[PDB]
């Protein structure tokens, strides 16, 4: 019952999958850099106490390391808490960073295909005291740039504010003590019925039926900027100062989103409440829409988190986003299967048909390596030429440099195109340039 | 008091440290690709049983995950054992891959500076049944290409074979019982004197003086190919078949190393024995030399390990493998110290959209978004009415070369004042031309 296997909910990345990974990360990183972000990295684990008391009910899904006599450690559940720890530890107030790394969650979803316990997040976060809603709006612009550039079909970004959500709960009659647990039930509305949620709130979490009904009247609503204006003219909700400020900030957000040319991509949705306790202002999730045949990014503002870490409680406003690339890898692979990607970049194979020429091949391949050319040879004393061409056909190697007794005497090499099969004599001094000229370089 | 802290022996990477990291990895990866390697990645943990019984006495330094009801898991101690597992699980016999990732070891060294429990390894490994010593020789070529290209001073690569080493103890009269404990004492010769080791073998590990002396006659020796020929003509050692084969393979190795133009960088050193149990043929460590040069400590290592995939395969089928790993943690310090000797940026922003007047935030957001859409790397200060002086100071510190200044009159006229942060010269530029003009000034 030892079996060769990766741990439950984790996968290797094959060369083919790594090719796709690099392509997706390249689009994402090009965008993060375009917005002037620094990059950092943190250890894979933190102290156990670092991650406790931050996430909410999801804290039950953290991987702990064994108590081996030393410190109690835990694998990072996301990149944001480590970011807040980095800020506080270094006493920083202002930084704009991106971070691309794996995170660790003991999930148990119904779909067990793919990497559901160890998966990459691509984060971008702006920390600092700035004027209202500008960095918030930029985060939404970054999401839309990226999702558009990846070309993974049409998408929509749902938006809300935790102040609106919690103020709406107050008007409906939810006590302040239940804001987190009721907000948690509303987060399930993307997977379950309203009836199933309503029953959870009444039967299990102890709400009254009447107030759950009232929550439904708001939660079902979604639209654009006109909905914000509507709710500002709402008689009941306008009397809540908390909600009033959140709505006022979303009004400002939509002004900036329009100037960024992405107001058409945003849905103000009152059912959106994120899964994590630390959000204080805006929150958002992007979802892919279906074209006829048949969440991919998320984030928000979290102004309290660095304060929990600072010795003297000093706060540092932060807003950010994270892109879930695991779904995207499947989609991008399916696009390429629809249109043969290589997993090496070898430009040439040094080869020979005759015997007793391994030494000369090693000389030549090394010469090429020293000139920066991507070169290989078969690890054989006297390989057959047919096998050498087959190795190239399968790898996608475009050229073969063939050595023979006579060619060494003459100071040339036979250069054959793997795809056309045409062969040309090339002077050994010219070989490097000729290879570069043929392979894009 | 709650303590803000990274776990013992681990560090963050600052933006500045990441810039250095990218520079080093870029040299390394350019070389791995040049040799036609595929790339893979594996999870950070394996099953606990995957890593047990492979490394030797070092197995006592593995990080285990908590038993939380499910499987027993462990953080990877290196990249080679996961590689062997990848091969066996997928039933592969032939693959040439590189892998750059962090590894996890509960070390306790005297020096506590830096990342000593979580650190990167850059591995390259060739698996397959091939003709003798060709892939082995290529691994050594890769080490020398890389260490030269990083420009971290002069270096030397020590080389040996486990068959030579184990055959040599036998002729000196060490019982098969003690091969592991005596091999462990000889591994200390890169840090301590021969006398101190000899005293450890005699007094503490119970060896006879006469046989420890005999071990010294071999172990103290190091040189190039002539030493290999010397030992082949050795009357005692030539009678050991195991050692004879290892010497024969090193003879062949030096022939190929010469053709690769790196025979001058290799020292056949009999005092070299690596720390891991799984090596079967050649083994090697690279060490930086000081400015005979002495020897500062090791920066790359590897060898041939023909038994490891066999331990994983259900039916015991072996897959010969040879490889190397580059320890980049020492290299980061050296490369940083080189740059301190000669101001590296941590962003690539080409331009800051700016204004000196008030009521122009809207127009700045329009412009910066225009630029983003044209692929230009652009920023603005998150301020309604920022001061121009502060905007120029933000650029000076960040290394941003250009500032695009908007004013009421400039919008009317359809132009932008473009100012160079480093020269301080300002030119009017038509708004249509702005993207091209920025590109033309900041490369391409
Ligand atoms: N860390 C959050 C996303 C986020 C990034 N920045 C702010 N929020 C998550 O894991 O879903
Ligand atoms: N895994 C070895 C190095 C190695 C790579 N390939 C063969 N050996 C180490 O960490 O020391």
XYZ file of N, CA, C and O and ligand atoms in Angstrom, chain A residues 77-81 105 121 123-125 274 276 278-279 298-302 319-322, ligand 1:
103
model
N -1.995 29.954 3.565
C -3.316 29.724 3.011
C -3.589 30.695 1.871
O -4.387 30.420 0.991
N -2.934 31.844 1.904
C -2.984 32.787 0.793
C -1.725 33.656 0.813
O -0.802 33.381 1.576
N -1.679 34.676 -0.034
C -0.505 35.533 -0.124
C -0.672 36.862 0.594
O 0.317 37.552 0.861
N -1.916 37.214 0.905
C -2.237 38.496 1.517
C -1.781 38.590 2.977
O -1.207 39.595 3.386
N -2.037 37.558 3.769
C -1.636 37.594 5.172
C -0.105 37.674 5.285
O 0.403 38.481 6.057
N -4.423 24.790 0.932
C -5.739 24.715 1.571
C -6.240 23.286 1.577
O -6.289 22.645 0.532
N -1.533 31.355 -6.973
C -2.229 32.621 -6.975
C -1.275 33.644 -7.554
O -0.066 33.559 -7.341
N -0.958 37.523 -7.275
C -1.464 38.656 -6.524
C -0.813 39.983 -6.885
O 0.361 40.034 -7.226
N -1.607 41.046 -6.768
C -1.158 42.420 -6.932
C -1.855 43.200 -5.840
O -3.064 43.076 -5.658
N -1.098 43.982 -5.087
C -1.635 44.670 -3.912
C -1.001 46.049 -3.754
O 0.201 46.209 -3.946
N -17.368 38.179 0.003
C -16.269 37.257 -0.190
C -16.176 36.274 0.969
O -16.904 36.381 1.964
N -13.642 35.665 3.009
C -12.635 35.974 4.016
C -13.053 37.156 4.892
O -13.670 38.113 4.410
N -11.333 39.503 6.431
C -10.522 40.730 6.552
C -10.866 41.905 5.620
O -10.270 42.977 5.740
N -11.855 41.744 4.744
C -12.246 42.833 3.856
C -13.075 43.891 4.574
O -13.945 43.575 5.374
N -10.279 37.453 -7.921
C -10.973 37.991 -6.756
C -10.070 38.837 -5.880
O -8.856 38.715 -5.932
N -10.674 39.706 -5.076
C -9.932 40.556 -4.124
C -10.787 41.627 -3.460
O -12.002 41.509 -3.410
N -10.150 42.675 -2.954
C -10.860 43.748 -2.270
C -9.955 44.598 -1.400
O -8.733 44.424 -1.400
N -10.557 45.507 -0.644
C -9.816 46.367 0.267
C -9.843 45.798 1.680
O -10.893 45.388 2.169
N -8.694 45.834 2.347
C -8.527 45.255 3.691
C -7.679 46.181 4.593
O -6.468 46.007 4.740
N -5.335 47.513 -0.729
C -6.324 46.997 -1.656
C -5.621 46.100 -2.656
O -4.471 46.356 -3.017
N -6.292 45.033 -3.090
C -5.636 44.043 -3.949
C -6.528 43.086 -4.712
O -7.752 43.170 -4.674
N -5.877 42.193 -5.432
C -6.541 41.223 -6.263
C -5.662 40.003 -6.378
O -4.455 40.064 -6.167
N -6.279 38.905 -6.775
C -5.595 37.651 -6.967
C -6.239 36.978 -8.160
O -7.459 36.995 -8.292
N -5.969 36.706 -0.711
C -7.347 36.700 -1.273
C -7.411 37.577 -2.510
C -6.805 38.930 -2.328
C -5.640 39.449 -2.771
N -5.578 40.745 -2.322
C -6.671 41.014 -1.635
N -7.427 39.933 -1.617
C -7.698 35.285 -1.669
O -6.896 34.373 -1.451
O -8.764 35.034 -2.241
